[PDB]
Amino acid sequence: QKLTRINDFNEVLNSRKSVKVFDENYKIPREEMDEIITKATKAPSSVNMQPWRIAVVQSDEMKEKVKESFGFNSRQLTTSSAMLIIFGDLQNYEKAEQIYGDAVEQQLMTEDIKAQLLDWILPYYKNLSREGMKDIVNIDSSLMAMQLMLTAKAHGYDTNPIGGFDKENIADIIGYDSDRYVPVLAIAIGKKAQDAHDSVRLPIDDVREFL
Ligand X SMILES: Cc1cc2nc3c(=O)[nH]c(=O)nc-3n(C[C@H](O)[C@H](O)[C@H](O)COP(=O)(O)O)c2cc1C
Site residues (vs ligand X, CB under 6 A):
17-18, 20, 44-48, 73, 139-140, 143, 160-164, 185, 196, 199
The most distant pair of C-alpha atoms in the chain lies apart, rounded to whole Å, by: 55
Query: What angle (nearest 5°) sits at the alpha carbon of residue 29, between those of residues 184 and 26?
Result: 90
Q: What's the min distance (Å) between Cβ of 193 and a copy of itself? A: 18
Bridge partners (DSSP) of residue 181 are 89
CA end-to-end distance (rounded Å), the chain: 48
Stretch that binds Ca ion, among 25-33, 35-43, 141-149, 179-187 (CB under 5 A): 179-187
Give the ranges where 43-197 is alpha helix by DSSP (H). 60-66, 74-79, 96-105, 111-126, 130-154, 170-174
Q: What's the min distance (Å) between Cβ of 91 and a copy of itself? A: 8
106-165 positions binding a copy of itself, by CB under 8 A: 106, 108-109, 131, 134-136, 138-140, 142-147, 149-151, 154, 161, 163
Question: Residue 25: which of ligand X, Ca ion, a copy of itself, none does it interact with, CB under 5 to 8 A by kind?
Answer: none
74-93 positions binding a copy of itself, by CB under 8 A: none
Q: What's the min distance (Å) between Cβ of 50 and a copy of itself? A: 5
Crossing angle of helices 96-105 and 111-126, in 10° steps, is: 160
